[PDB]
Design a protein around this ligand. Structure first.
Ligand SMILES: CP(=O)(O)N[C@@H](CCCNC(=N)N)C(=O)O
Ligand SMILES: CP(=O)(O)N[C@@H](CCCNC(=N)N)C(=O)O
Ligand SMILES: [Zn+2]
Ligand SMILES: [Zn+2]
Ligand SMILES: [Zn+2]
Ligand SMILES: [Zn+2]
Lengths: 403, 403
């Protein structure tokens, strides 16, 4: 067997919020088999990995990434590349994401099953990357945020998964699952980077969303809904959607429903900084930069409000909108908008794994879980920005980065 | 500018076949700007790369690879993977190929523009790999070696580029070029790994092949033809095809025509060793292993004969049939079947670049060419197997591998 014995100054238990001193974490064939103390016995063959002075955390989880997109290629600039360019560069993005300490991610919309292919390649050992929960292709209403909206009718550009009835949406779920979707991503409202809508406009009916949820849940998979507008958020929650992405303009009623039903919010409150700084240079049209400004501050204020009200938060950044590998920059923003460092860390570890239905496998350094860990200098309970520069990353017992 | 100053014990001039002692090769922004002597002046900023005791050669060229295929996944085993799995793993194969010292390769048939995407990603700097000349999708006759041949009619599996008239073949060339083909690959005869044919069976008419060549040549691109059978080889050469792949059962008349017209032969004489050892384990059906045995030794004997007769040889291995990264194993086989080490080396450097129409850019360590080089221990003019374990690889001035 392949055995690593990892020691450090401290380990953060993300469930209890307490530090454990002088941990010795044994990982056997990719799974944590022991969390003891430095100086404890190790099995024969164990390879020592010693990290003096630093603090171990679980591998981090980003619930909202687009690995086959590039922040710097916005707007029509993307048209210059072949289709398979994206299928290839996602490999580099996966590598950057893992090296930043993000050992599990949820890809919530990619082109032509790119993310399914990437998952298969990583899982089989051909290329390095996070454990990817793959949504495959995201969909919603014809003409909506998940459709192609930047072209005239002569070009007849449309998402083949456009769904305009509950039964068509059900069929989309079935087709996506058939070809590798492990979670379903739908567009319940308009958005920032699409054309011909506003974020507040609901785009799927309650009935349409309910059919998606009912079908996904029969197969034991979850549903994530893109939703900025208040009514889209409320109705998605009511329909049983598992996670609400963005959740930017949520109202009191939506917050209350989310608490009642146990829906998670996945709020990408960092990336507006990047968009406003670099979007124009990157090819984003003015109308879209405008919509981003319309929702940026409100989303942050609503994160604070929803957090205070008890809505379960997961860490979702929309990597791809901003550069892959910068995924940890959002922790600080969550703290600025009300979270303790512990809550912010929990959103990308304990709570994220719960929202994935993968608590047995990821999200904590505990016996039975995958040997996915990072180490950071300093005191992450006191300063969450320490997560921006991990000194150590391990995934499935493999050392990705180390001092 | 990015400047490297590379010194070594010797440099092999592949044009003259002579060693140059104590070379100092300066590479500026990826291009060789000087080949002087160790101890010579260097421009300000130059980074020293010193390789004592070893011999520099040009970066090696493999004229026949399939980067989005895997040797170990043969037969129906490939069906278990998603389409984009292949689009991703080609990244790993590209990396292994570069690390083996192969800095330029010609991909002669890939799925759904995989190779075009890979080329774009490498060239833009996202992932490491060789300079890839991309054939995109290979094609020939309906039911032929380039078609899908392992499925019943109910499944209606067919290569969309199947061409059954000169004008349809011309259209295929035009469509392939439109979407990134830099060279055209056609199937002129049956083959080993397809079903329902024998290698000796010609599958495109002279007229069909002539139309392909005429069209490709108008656009200034070349044509490579898969051809085992004698008549397919003769007629492809007569039609003006630039390189003949495999060329396994060439006859006297085909050899004479190839010399007369200046056609190159690209003979993959190594891989039968791998196929006979591992093919069955890898999922290759018995009928195909049989066809491989039918052509293996004859191809080698005909390489010797064609080489002696003066046919211009290029280095083409069919990586993908055997493991990517093992590309240098064929040199020894060429020497066993008549080549001098120099001729074998020339086939993967000087002659290959000429067959690519890229003599100004690759194939030699000379001013103006890309800074693509390897270094090997020992005396490659005396023992070509030294190329199997290069100690140094550089591509576009970037150090890929070094002592
Ligand atoms: C593909 P996507 O739905 O994640 N893109 C979002 C990005 C939201 C961007 N902005 C803020 N969080 N402020 C949108 O176009 O609505
Ligand atoms: C995709 P492909 O045409 O390179 N495959 C060849 C492999 C030839 C294999 N054998 C020998 N060189 N003996 C074929 O199926 O005919
Ligand atoms: Zn969204
Ligand atoms: Zn998104
Ligand atoms: Zn062939
Ligand atoms: Zn081939």
């Amino acid at each position: 067997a392949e055995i690593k014995a990892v020691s450090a100054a401290r380990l953060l238990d993300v469930a209890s919020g307490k530090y454990v001193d002088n941990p010795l974490v044994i990982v056997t064939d990719g799974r944590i088999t022991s969390i003891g103390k430095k100086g404890d016995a190790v099995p024969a063959g164990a390879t020592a990995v010693d990290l003096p002075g630093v603090t171990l955390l679980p591998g981090l989880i980003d619930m909202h990434v687009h690995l086959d997109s590039l922040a710097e290629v916005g707007g029509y600039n993307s048209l210059e590349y072949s289709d398979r360019f994206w299928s290839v560069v996602q490999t580099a993005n996966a590598k950057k994401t893992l090296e930043a300490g993000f050992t599990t991610v949820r890809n919530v919309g990619a082109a032509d099953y790119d993310d399914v292919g990437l998952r298969e390649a990583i899982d089989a050992g051909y290329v390095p990357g996070p454990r990817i929960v793959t949504a495959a292709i995201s969909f919603g209403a014809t003409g909506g945020h998940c459709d192609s909206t930047f072209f005239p009718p002569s070009m007849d550009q449309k998402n083949p998964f456009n769904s305009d009835s509950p039964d068509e949406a059900r069929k989309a779920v079935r087709t996506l699952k058939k070809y590798g979707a492990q979670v379903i991503k739908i567009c319940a409202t308009g958005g920032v980077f699409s054309r011909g809508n506003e974020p507040g406009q609901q785009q799927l009916t309650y009935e349409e969303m309910k059919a998606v949820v009912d079908e996904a849940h029969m197969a034991g998979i979850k549903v994530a809904a893109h939703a900025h507008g208040a009514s889209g958020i409320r109705e998605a929650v009511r329909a049983g959607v598992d996670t609400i992405e963005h959740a930017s303009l949520v109202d009191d009623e939506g917050i209350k429903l989310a608490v009642q039903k146990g829906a998670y919010f996945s709020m990408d409150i960092y990336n507006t900084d990047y968009t406003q700084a670099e979007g124009k240079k990157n090819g984003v049209l003015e109308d879209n930069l405008r919509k981003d400004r319309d929702i940026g501050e409100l989303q942050r204020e609503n994160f604070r409000k929803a957090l205070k009200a008890g809505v379960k938060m997961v860490y979702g950044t929309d990597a791809g909108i901003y550069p892959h590998g910068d995924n940890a920059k959002q922790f600080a923003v969550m703290v600025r908008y009300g979270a303790t460092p512990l809550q912010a860390i929990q959103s990308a570890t304990l709570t994220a794994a719960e929202a994935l239905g993968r608590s047995k496998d990821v999200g904590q350094v505990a016996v039975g879980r995958y040997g996915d860990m990072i180490a950071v200098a300093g005191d992450p309970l006191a300063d969450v920005t320490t997560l921006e520069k991990p000194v150590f990353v391990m995934k499935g017992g493999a050392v990705v980065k180390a001092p």
